Design a protein around this ligand. Structure first.
Ligand SMILES: CCCCCCCCCCCCO[C@@H]1O[C@H](CO)[C@@H](O[C@H]2O[C@H](CO)[C@@H](O)[C@H](O)[C@H]2O)[C@H](O)[C@H]1O
Ligand SMILES: [K+]
Ligand SMILES: [K+]
Ligand SMILES: [K+]
Lengths: 263, 263
């Protein structure tokens, strides 16, 4: 029963509105030249195609472009030849989509695209999320206890050297943040970098988005039509599962930093 | 804090839930995909047969350019106007709110190596702050709801049933009131403004409030004229719905804790 007074919450609300306004202005400044280059590229490509081929007509070209856009919304890949029997909605991939929907990540790479699918998605999401929340809390507690006990043992071994009451806590917090961060985020980013054509920055951005639960869908593991291992979606989902508890703890630590900045 | 065995049992239950959901989704959704796959292949073959001059390699090059454009974030369906852009202040404000809220619609993404870094930094600092806002509003609403429950708690009138029946009825009434105010009335507003299917409107509202954020339907995705404050009002409704639902869930969680303590 925290019961923060109305003035405090409206202060936080004003802060949040300022935060979005600053974010919107910076994002507009960054995006506008890249968008301009994009707009020029597409206009130039359309003009070049029309000039190159007499047969093509603006109406027919627009119709083909519209059909391709509908295909992208549909989820079918227009490029080259799609395989009807394999490489789409594999038991692993559908499992991964179910894991994201319950996890709330929601990549958007694959969607129901049917009335029954949409109704199933709403019912399945509402039933699935409380269970996954309970599981996340339980896994977080178990991981926290095991990790803490391990730190306890390592510290107790190293407690005698350089004893300080400030340093013991600063070392414990820094050790937990870095040790968890390297395995949970740094190692998957490198593995993603090697397995797929994505650059290191893109891979790190992908890991931050999934662990953070934003799930933009700009980068999705397994999305590219390339050869994959037999069980790639389950291992990635399991990594997301273990990673989320630690990232939630990190979010709590940043929240604590914010509150302290409060006084 | 629960036993390790309980975590394994819940993990097994969630995995079985995921497998049954994945199988149902796969069976439910392969016919639509097949019809789509046939439609795209027929459209491409029809285009090739219709025009002799256009070769398959050129068609593939165009398809690759269009898919890159969709990934880039610029629609190719119609000739664009440089003055009007996707990264407008209202839309950028909506995207920033989406980032802090972890909805992650994904229609608009940084698509730049500086923008992506700013996105990770912005999301990490913003999200705990949004969490504190959500918790503060949730607890204030919980306090008003508790006072209202106490007000209706007295039952000296005719047909006063058990307290358990009363609490269940109050919870059901509150959930129905929230569902009507946020799940259904905005869905009708969205249906009116964007001409979406009646099922699609609730699907979008559930996804947005739930925070899964597939990106299939976005308030500002369609390129049609909109009110100047459409994106800010939509984000304001998202915040109000999330906060109210968070308050209701917190009240149920506290009551659940009490129930567990009892008997
Ligand atoms: C309890 C009544 C709900 C009945 C639902 C009937 C209509 C369906 C509308 C779906 C609304 C879902 O509303 C509920 O809101 C809470 C808000 O914390 C969401 O909770 C989510 O919030 C945060 C965002 O800050 C996420 O990072 C997190 O993954 C998750 O906990 C739930 O995912 C969702 O279950
Ligand atoms: K989320
Ligand atoms: K999300
Ligand atoms: K998302």
């Amino acid at each position: 029963t925290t019961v923060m007074k109305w003035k405090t919450v409206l202060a936080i609300f004003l802060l949040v509105v300022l935060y979005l306004i600053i974010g919107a202005t910076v994002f507009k400044a960054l995006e506008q030249p890249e968008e301009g280059l994009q707009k020029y590229r597409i206009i130039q490509e359309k003009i070049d195609f029309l000039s190159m081929h007499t047969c093509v007509q603006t109406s027919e070209l627009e119709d083909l472009v519209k059909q391709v856009v509908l295909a992208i919304r549909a989820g079918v890949n227009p490029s080259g030849h799609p395989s009807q029997e394999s490489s789409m909605w594999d038991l692993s991939s559908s499992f991964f989509f179910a894991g994201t929907v319950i996890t709330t990540i929601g990549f958007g790479n694959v969607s129901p695209h049917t009335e029954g699918g949409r109704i199933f998605c709403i019912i399945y999401a509402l039933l699935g999320i409380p269970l996954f929340g309970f599981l996340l809390a339980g896994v977080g507690d178990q991981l926290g206890t095991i990790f803490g006990k391990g730190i306890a043992k390592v510290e107790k071994m190293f407690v005698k050297w350089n004893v300080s009451q400030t340093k013991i806590r600063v070392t414990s917090t820094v050790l937990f943040i870095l040790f968890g961060c390297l395995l949970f985020v740094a190692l998957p980013a490198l593995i993603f970098q090697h397995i797929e054509g994505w650059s290191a920055l893109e891979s790190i951005y992908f890991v931050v988005i999934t662990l953070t639960t934003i799930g933009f869908g700009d980068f999705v593991a397994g999305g590219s039509e390339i050869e994959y291992l037999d069980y790639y979606k389950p291992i990635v989902w399991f990594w997301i599962l273990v990673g989320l508890a630690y990232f939630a703890a990190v979010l709590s630590m940043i929240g604590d930093w914010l509150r302290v900045i409060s006084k």
